[PDB]
Amino acid sequence: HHHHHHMVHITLDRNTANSWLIISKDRRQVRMGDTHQNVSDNKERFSNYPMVLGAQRFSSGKMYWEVDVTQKEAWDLGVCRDSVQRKGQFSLSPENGFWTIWLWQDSYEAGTSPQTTLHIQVPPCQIGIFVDYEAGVVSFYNITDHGSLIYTFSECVFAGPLRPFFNVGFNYSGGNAAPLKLCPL
Ligand SMILES: O=C(c1csnn1)N1CCOCC1
Ligand SMILES: O=C(c1csnn1)N1CCOCC1
């Protein structure tokens, strides 16, 4: 792909984080803690899942960023509406305001409803995410495999400002402690 020139500097918004997440000083890395991280509750925090939003809001233009997923067993990545549900249980779908892909149990899937099987020969260590607001497109790229396309959501109905979306996943197995990291431009 040739989307690299739309690169944006994403930082994580601590106030939206699930209370077990640990975000680095530079706000560029996040991991699952093994306990509550001693923060007060607020209406922005994702309560049920290890999720956090980017601070940036996008309402126009073309945007690109990259995320490092090295040695993780489970995660979700993409974008979401600023007004997605924070509390209780929900599925990641465009109907609920999410445009995402994930790794779970050794398979990759796009967060359509129902979910769509992805075809990835080279397990990615870094994922590229491209948003074209005007066109209604969210695309995902395998940076480990020379930028090959993973998935394109088209005919998106964003219906609001968009925020970068992250889920570090649970660590029930003891094999999923590694962080998500925003990669440098
Ligand atoms: O259920 C758990 C849990 C215990 S161990 N893994 N996570 N929660 C509830 C949702 O916020 C994160 C902590
Ligand atoms: O945004 C939507 C949408 C809103 S409700 N269901 N459809 N999408 C996402 C991109 O793939 C096509 C459908």
UniProtKB/Swiss-Prot annotation:
Autoubiquitinated; does not lead to its proteasomal degradation. Deubiquitinated by USP4; leading to its stabilization. Autoubiquitinated. It is found in: Cytoplasm; Cytoplasmic vesicle, Autophagosome; Nucleus; Cytoplasm, P-body. Induction: Up-regulated by IFN. It comes from the Eukaryota. Residues 8-185 form the B30.2/SPRY domain. The coiled-coil is necessary for the cytoplasmic localization. The RING-type zinc finger is necessary for ubiquitination and for the IRF3-driven interferon beta promoter activity. Interacts with SKP2 and CUL1 in a RING finger-independent manner. The RING-type zinc finger is necessary for ubiquitination of NMI. E3 ubiquitin-protein ligase whose activity is dependent on E2 enzymes, UBE2D1, UBE2D2, UBE2E1 and UBE2E2. Forms a ubiquitin ligase complex in cooperation with the E2 UBE2D2 that is used not only for the ubiquitination of USP4 and IKBKB but also for its self-ubiquitination. Component of cullin-RING-based SCF (SKP1-CUL1-F-box protein) E3 ubiquitin-protein ligase complexes such as SCF(SKP2)-like complexes. A TRIM21-containing SCF(SKP2)-like complex is shown to mediate ubiquitination of CDKN1B ('Thr-187' phosphorylated-form), thereby promoting its degradation by the proteasome. Belongs to the TRIM/RBCC family. Homotrimer. Component of a SCF(SKP2)-like complex containing CUL1, SKP1, TRIM21 and SKP2. Interacts with CALR, CUL1, FBXW11, HSPA5, IKBKB, IRF3, SKP1 and VCP. Interacts with SKP2; the interaction with SKP2 does not depend on an intact F-box domain. Interacts (via N-terminus and C-terminus) with DCP2 (via N-terminus and C-terminus). Interacts (via C-terminus) with IRF8 (via C-terminus). Interacts with ULK1, BECN1 and with ATG8 family members, including GABARAP, GABARAPL1, GABARAPL2 and MAP1LC3C/LC3C. Interacts with TRIM21 and SQSTM1/sequestosome 1. Interacts with IRF3. This is E3 ubiquitin-protein ligase TRIM21. It comes from Mus musculus (Mouse). The lineage of its organism: Eukaryota, Metazoa, Chordata, Craniata, Vertebrata. The gene is Trim21.
